[PDB]
From a paper:
Type VII secretion systems (T7SSs), also referred to as ESAT-6 secretion (ESX) systems, are AAA+-dependent molecular machines that are found in the Actinomycetota phylum and have gained great attention due to their implications in cell homeo­stasis and host–pathogen interactions in mycobacteria. Among them, ESX-5 is found almost exclusively in slow-growing pathogenic mycobacteria, where it participates in nutrient uptake, intracellular colonization and modulation of the immune response during infection through the secretion of a large family of protein effectors: the PE and PPE proteins. EccC is a pivotal component of the pore complex, providing the secretion driving force via the hydrolysis of ATP. In the ESX-2 to ESX-5 systems, EccC consists of two N-terminal transmembrane (TM) helices connected to two additional helices (the stalk region) and a domain of unknown function (EccCDUF), which are followed by three FtsK/SpoIIIE AAA+ ATPase domains, here referred to as D1, D2 and D3.
Here, the crystal structure of the MtbEccC5 DUF domain is reported at 2.05 Å resolution, which reveals a nucleotide-free structure with degenerated cis-acting and trans-acting elements involved in ATP binding and hydrolysis. The core structure consists of a six-stranded parallel β-sheet (β5–β1–β4–β3–β2–β2′) further extended by an additional two-stranded antiparallel sheet (β6–β7). The C-terminal α-helical lid present in other prokaryotic AAA+ domains is missing in the structure, which is flanked by two parallel helices (αA and αB) and a two-stranded antiparallel sheet (βA–βB) that connects to the stalk domain. This structure is conserved in both molecules present in the asymmetric unit (r.m.s.d. of 0.173 Å for 218 Cα atoms). The proposed ATP-binding site should be located at the N-terminus of the α1 helix and the C-terminus of the β3 strand, which are expected to contain the P-loop and the Walker B motif, respectively. Sequence analysis of the Walker A motif shows a highly degenerated and one amino acid shorter sequence (GEREQVL231) that is missing the conserved G2 and G3 glycines as well as the Lys and Thr/Ser residues that are key for ATP/Mg2+ stabilization (Val30 and Leu231 in). Inspection of the crystal model shows an ATP-free structure in which the degenerated Walker A motif folds as an extended α1 helix instead of the standard P-loop conformation. Altogether, this points to variations of G2 and G3 as structural factors responsible for the extended α1 helix observed in . Inspection of the Walker B motif also shows conformational deviations in , which include a shorter β3–α3 loop and a hydrophobic residue (Val329) replacing the catalytic base.
Residue numbers in the entry: 124 to 166, 166A, 166B, 166C, 199 to 274, 284 to 310, 316 to 417
């Protein structure tokens, strides 16, 4: 019963700090049996005047079915959703299964990720696409095009593209990069031209997207419909989760 036990797999992201160190942390497995591997909660099903009468179920995206997602909206709500996605993944998946990278011309917003092992380089926070491409050359060398979803190859890489830079094209083509999912925050045309990858916000925090099948993640309509009332994690909530995970790692 996935809807009955949804709080064990996809809870509200501000509950994750208190749950750090529980047996649900880093429990996801790329074994072909865990259908939540590579899945991340983005929000809830209730919205507007219907919030009080709709049984709220989590809404999610799979990292394995698209080479990227493009978050289109106002700066703060786009950052809030990205922080919720990062916190969800850092809690549910171990850094041996999911690694993370941020490429941003706004470093002040990403200082909190210094506590997460997922961003540790064997810190994967870069200020330009050129610096990122030099540091991550070994990641991209020999990698083919993205193949949408047996055992999943690991680590999967989640990259936050937060810099409007024409050099993005020379790193991520239309075919995508195998084992990587980008999340664009800029709203530039190269990311937003594919409709099945767009998450369009409205001022209330509701996102619309092409609906997908609940079991296969396959797109089921070519027009955008309600997708989720997004989860929003503030800098303080994200830093609280990140520091709590860091203290668990030191203990």
């Amino acid at each position: 019963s996935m809807d009955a036990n949804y709080r064990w797999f996809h809870p509200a992201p501000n509950t994750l700090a208190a749950a750090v160190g529980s047996p649900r942390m880093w429990e996801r497995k790329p074994d072909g049996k865990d259908l939540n591997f590579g899945v991340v909660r983005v929000g809830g099903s209730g919205f507007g005047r219907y919030q009080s009468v709709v049984y709220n179920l989590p809404k999610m995206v799979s990292l394995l079915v698209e080479p990227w997602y493009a978050l289109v909206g106002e700066r703060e709500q786009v950052l809030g959703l990205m922080r919720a996605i990062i916190c969800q993944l850092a809690f549910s998946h171990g850094p041996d299964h999911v690694q993370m990278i941020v490429v941003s011309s706004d470093l002040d917003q990403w200082d909190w990720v210094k506590w997460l092992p997922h961003f540790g380089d064997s810190r994967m926070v870069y200020t330009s696409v050129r610096e990122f491409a030099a540091e991550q050359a070994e990641l991209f060398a020999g990698r083919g095009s993205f193949t949408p979803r047996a055992q999943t190859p690991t680590p999967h890489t989640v990259i936050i593209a937060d810099v409007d830079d024409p050099q993005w094209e020379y790193v991520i083509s239309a075919e995508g990069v195998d084992g990587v999912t980008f999340f664009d925050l800029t709203g530039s045309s190269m990311w937003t031209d594919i409709p099945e990858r767009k998450l369009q916000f409205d001022k209330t925090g509701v996102i619309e997207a092409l609906p997908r099948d609940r079991d296969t993640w396959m797109v089921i309509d070519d027009k955008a419909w309600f997708f989720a009332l997004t989860d929003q994690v503030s800098i303080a909530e994200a830093e609280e989760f990140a520091q709590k995970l860091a203290q668990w790692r030191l203990a």
